[PDB]
């Protein structure tokens, strides 16, 4: 069985990622910031894309943004599927770490610029699996370690 909501989320997000159009303080010719950021990743051989949540919020009546806020943990693999197809279209050099088989590149989808910041005290378990932004002061840190992923 396939998650129709997840697949439709992937379709919407993939389209947004490849063709979200804007520019400012410049000519009116649209920059298509995330396609251009994929080019920047291709130049500097990066493996993450930074996404402004408000750009999703204005897109398509914000329905996609609401879905990704409410049920982020469900839809993150679908977002990676959409991102992978866009990277195939506009920067297929990046699908590998880039012969011995240079492995599949993983993509971290680093959201930012959320509507509101929750405090550590505002944690409440309905928000399990949802996207938030959190603030506090870093009182201690771990050693950086390898987590077995695949």
């Amino acid at each position: 069985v396939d998650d129709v909501t997840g697949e439709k989320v992937r379709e919407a997000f993939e389209q947004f990622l490849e063709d979200f159009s804007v520019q400012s303080t410049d000519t009116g010719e649209v920059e298509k910031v995330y396609r251009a950021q994929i080019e920047f990743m291709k130049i500097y051989d990066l493996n993450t894309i930074y996404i402004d949540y408000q750009h999703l919020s204005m897109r398509e009546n914000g329905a996609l943004a609401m879905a990704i806020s409410e049920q982020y943990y469900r839809f993150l693999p679908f977002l990676q599927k959409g991102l992978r197809r866009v990277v195939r279209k506009y920067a297929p050099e990046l699908l590998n770490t880039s012969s011995p088989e240079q492995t599949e590149r993983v993509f971290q989808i680093s959201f930012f610029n959320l509507p509101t910041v929750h405090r550590i005290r505002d944690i409440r378990s309905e928000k399990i699996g949802s996207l938030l932004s959190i603030s506090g002061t870093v009182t201690r840190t771990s050693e950086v370690r390898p987590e077995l992923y695949k």
Partner: protein, 597 residues
Amino acid sequence: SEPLRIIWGTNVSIQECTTNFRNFLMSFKYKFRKILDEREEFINNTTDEELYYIKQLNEMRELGTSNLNLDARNLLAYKQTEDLYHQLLNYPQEVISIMDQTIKDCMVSLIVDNNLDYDLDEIETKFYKVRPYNVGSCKGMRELNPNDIDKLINLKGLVLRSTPVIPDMKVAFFKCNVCDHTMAVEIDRGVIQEPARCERIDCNEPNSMSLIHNRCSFADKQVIKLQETPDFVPDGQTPHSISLCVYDELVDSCRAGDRIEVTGTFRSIPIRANSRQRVLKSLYKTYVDVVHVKKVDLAKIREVAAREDLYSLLARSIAPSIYELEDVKKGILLQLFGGTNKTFRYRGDINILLCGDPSTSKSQILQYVHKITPRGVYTSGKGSSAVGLTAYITRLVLESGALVLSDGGVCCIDEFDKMSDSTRSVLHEVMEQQTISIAKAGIITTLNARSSILASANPIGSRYNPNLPVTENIDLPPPLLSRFDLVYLVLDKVDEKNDRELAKHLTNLYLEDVLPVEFLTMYISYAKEHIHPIITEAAKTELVRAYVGMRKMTATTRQLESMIRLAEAHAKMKLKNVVELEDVQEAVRLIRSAIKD
């Protein structure tokens, strides 16, 4: 011919319980409660004919909120529901679930019977809760016994600490490894009802469902430790304590140090000998599973603000039990008002000290301002009776001292002469920068103290000598003494024209029952909330000429800054939004009195 839904072990019909509750949750009137309670002649139709719980549900539905408070005596006031009270006490979880469901049904039925349009889908989606309270006598924590093990009880006590919020699973979420089909399973009595085979008959693989932890649905649980209040303890032994479990929007109803009531079902559960075994200990953990918790104007403001004698009126009202020290009272009132802040730091704090003889009214004065101020503290210059002045690292944790705890309030310090030297140094950066610098254990910060200090200090020995300066009488050094805006001397020197009238004023308190002493806090509150004085352009020239005058008479810019802050405080008084020439003049005059010491 039909099945019956029964509260198990009781023979109570749930249909009867439901309708007995419904016919009170609607059609109850508050007039009936005064029939039950004392002073029944205070019934009044124009206030008491109200359909009280229809009124509650209407305001509640306009706020869209899930919770209803219910004083349990209101059940006993109403004929069809007095039995429901006993069922509520004796069989609480079933009756409370019935009451919850009935509240939701009342909300649903109102928007189709009273028939105003509303989001039916919103009510359908929402859960609803009753919060019964005042269930009965607040029986002692030490008095509980195994007959209580399922009853709705009431407790009073002191909160020691609470856990962080604990996620409690309400619906497990399962996914099939082979076919990726998903199904939701409600958690029943804390047990996961795992599907042994995949639901889809076209797949039906055994043992293939797996739990997807972060797609389950979780309620909020919190555990709070409640200590027996020392009012109830027998004198020769430790207080007891009870752990209480609290859920959802009742999480963080209280914090450490709160004295509270709780209404809740007394519960007990077994605990294991070791986690790898089912084997249980033969005596259960007890806890209370709470359902309610509780702790322990502008027209007049503008009317009083029109008065001409307001400065003297408010000043005498801060401590009318104390014989005349009126410039001290005026100074402390102006300290209560305070100046203003600015972004760029310069801030609104005003700082005062009292010295002179020890056996005099200064301690009472500190106590009165402590009682008046919203969030101040009382302390003394050294030592710690589990409360101390400076911020301090201890076990590893940083504790905030009385100065830091007095953020936004007056910090009252007695024995300020006998203060320890590390504290004497620490006071400089709160006097100047209103902060204290912390640089330990991987944390570096200027911990902002933001407190006005009222000090009380003493001479060396039993008597102050007024033929010697303040620095010669007092222990604490001049550079710290210089930081205070106003500094005062209170002396026990004999004079019958003062002492007799003081004694008569003091002794008359034992016989007698304008002084707006209880309105003072409200006036201070609204003034601090609403009024932010700015300096008039003419007041610039007034401040400059006054400063150069006292400079021609050893002043420093700290005196000018003090005159600014006092004038701004004087403008919060009378609710004036711009500092006037008279405000500068009184700030100047009071400082001219103080600096002459």
